[PDB]
Amino acid sequence: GSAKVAFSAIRSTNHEPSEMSNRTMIIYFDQVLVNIGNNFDSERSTFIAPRKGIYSFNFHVVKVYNRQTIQVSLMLNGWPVISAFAGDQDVTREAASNGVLIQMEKGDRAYLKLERGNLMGGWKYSTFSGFLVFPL
Amino acid sequence: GSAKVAFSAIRSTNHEPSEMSNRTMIIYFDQVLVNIGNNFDSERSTFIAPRKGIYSFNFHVVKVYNRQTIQVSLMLNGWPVISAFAGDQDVTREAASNGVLIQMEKGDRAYLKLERGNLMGGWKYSTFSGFLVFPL
Amino acid sequence: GSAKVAFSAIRSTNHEPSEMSNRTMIIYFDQVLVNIGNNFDSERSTFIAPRKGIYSFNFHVVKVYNRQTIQVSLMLNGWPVISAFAGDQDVTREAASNGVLIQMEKGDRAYLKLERGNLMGGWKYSTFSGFLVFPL
Ligand SMILES: *[C@@H]1O[C@H](CO)[C@@H](O[C@@H]2O[C@H](CO)[C@@H](O)[C@H](O)[C@H]2NC(C)=O)[C@H](O)[C@H]1NC(C)=O
Numbered sequence: 001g002s003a004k005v006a007f008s009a010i011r012s013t014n015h016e017p018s019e020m021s022n023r024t025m026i027i028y029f030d031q032v033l034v035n036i037g038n039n040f041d042s043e044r045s046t047f048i049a050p051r052k053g054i055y056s057f058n059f060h061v062v063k064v065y066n067r068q069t070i071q072v073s074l075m076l077n078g079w080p081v082i083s084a085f086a087g088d089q090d091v092t093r094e095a096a097s098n099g100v101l102i103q104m105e106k107g108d109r110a111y112l113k114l115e116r117g118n119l120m121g122g123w124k125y126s127t128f129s130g131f132l133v134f135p136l
Numbered sequence: 137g138s139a140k141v142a143f144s145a146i147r148s149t150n151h152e153p154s155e156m157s158n159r160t161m162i163i164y165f166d167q168v169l170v171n172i173g174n175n176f177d178s179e180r181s182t183f184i185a186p187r188k189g190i191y192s193f194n195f196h197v198v199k200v201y202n203r204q205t206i207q208v209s210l211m212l213n214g215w216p217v218i219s220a221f222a223g224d225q226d227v228t229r230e231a232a233s234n235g236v237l238i239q240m241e242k243g244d245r246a247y248l249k250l251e252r253g254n255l256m257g258g259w260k261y262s263t264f265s266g267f268l269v270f271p272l
Numbered sequence: 273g274s275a276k277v278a279f280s281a282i283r284s285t286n287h288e289p290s291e292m293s294n295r296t297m298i299i300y301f302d303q304v305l306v307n308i309g310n311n312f313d314s315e316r317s318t319f320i321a322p323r324k325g326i327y328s329f330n331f332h333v334v335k336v337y338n339r340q341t342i343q344v345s346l347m348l349n350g351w352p353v354i355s356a357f358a359g360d361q362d363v364t365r366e367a368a369s370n371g372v373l374i375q376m377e378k379g380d381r382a383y384l385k386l387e388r389g390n391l392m393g394g395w396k397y398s399t400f401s402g403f404l405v406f407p408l
Pocket residue numbers: 017018019022118120
């Protein structure tokens with residue numbers, strides 16, 4: 001029970017970044033598909049760990065042609081753990097994708113941040129998900 | 137026991153799409169590596185959920201140069217949950233990859249569908265896998 | 273307890289391949305983020321399964337422009353289970369990414385091998401992780 005913890009969120013439209021998102025560079029997901037434990041904060045697109053354990057995260061951030069390459073980082077309490085990268089071309093939607101397992105303590109925060117480049121043109125089809133693999 | 141549910145499948149050759157696959161646009165995996173619970177239907181390349189829970193899925197669909205870009209969607213009972221994308225070039229094999237967690241009920245179906253483009257030239261090296269994270 | 277098994281490793285610098293790595297073509301990860309059970313051998317960048325079960329693996333191998341395309345394979349006791357691919361360009365860091373579930377027996381070994389191409393220029397930002405989904 002207290003060890004069933006999972007979330008899943010997607011970007012459902014190609015609408016543009018909000019003003020606050022330009023300031024945080026935190027990547028926003030409007031449609032929450034799964035939120036067992038209610039530990040993902042959808043306003044802030046941030047997972048907050050309810051207990052000590054090993055957590056898994058995956059993300060795929062989709063961009064269109066927009067005169068920019070990007071770097072996306074999964075952030076743990078404001079420090080980048082992993083990054084992914086995408087280029088700039090008009091042939092196809094393209095994704096920055098990566099995933100990892102990390103230890104988190106209670107209250108630890110995980111979210112995605114655009115380190116380099118921007119998502120003007122939208123980031124429809126973007127995904128972010130994660131779950132407690134086991135408590136420690 | 138009834139909560140150990142996992143599958144894994146790959147495309148082992150670069151052979152071309154069958155006639156029926158042209159009609160469904162459902163992506164076929166010939167080699168099943170894991171099938172605990174026997175809940176993946178290999179003929180139809182479809183996972184059928186044996187019980188209510190949160191399930192994880194991952195896929196990577198590999199294409200060669202074939203004058204087409206692709207969009208691949210994970211389908212839940214015929215509705216696309218996530219998509220991934222790949223372009224068209226002759227430099228390298230390229231993948232449409234994405235993954236997500238979703239709630240499924242008993243009898244719910246998960247499979248992959250080519251929404252845009254085709255896989256003439258084969259989709260060798262393609263992978264699809266998933267598992268019950270926990271029952272609900 | 274004996275069913276909590278997880279690792280996570282990354283490549284933290286853009287330093288070049290060592291001589292021994294040129295001989296094995298085994299991809300090395302210097303920073304180990306998670307190692308529950310201590311079943312990942314960091315010197316050899318190899319996970320050694322402590323018991324029979326279904327294990328999940330994910331990897332993303334990041335390259336720079338280096339006049340080479342690559343193929344990366346997850347190896348199970350020296351045989352490639354899945355592969356991923358990346359091309360060669362100077363626009364952006366690019367990744368060969370894939371993931372899968374496999375059955376392993378006790379003592380089985382999982383590691384990543386560069387089947388085609390090389391990682392001159394470094395493979396900073398590369399990731400490799402995996403966990404026991406359940407014992408069998
Ligand atoms: C968020 O930031 C982008 C830039 O990253 C803003 O779009 C730019 O606006 C400037 C100044 O008006 C123009 O010169 C460019 O046309 C835009 N640049 C790009 C790269 O598109 C965008 O409007 C901002 N959105 C807000 C604050 O809501």
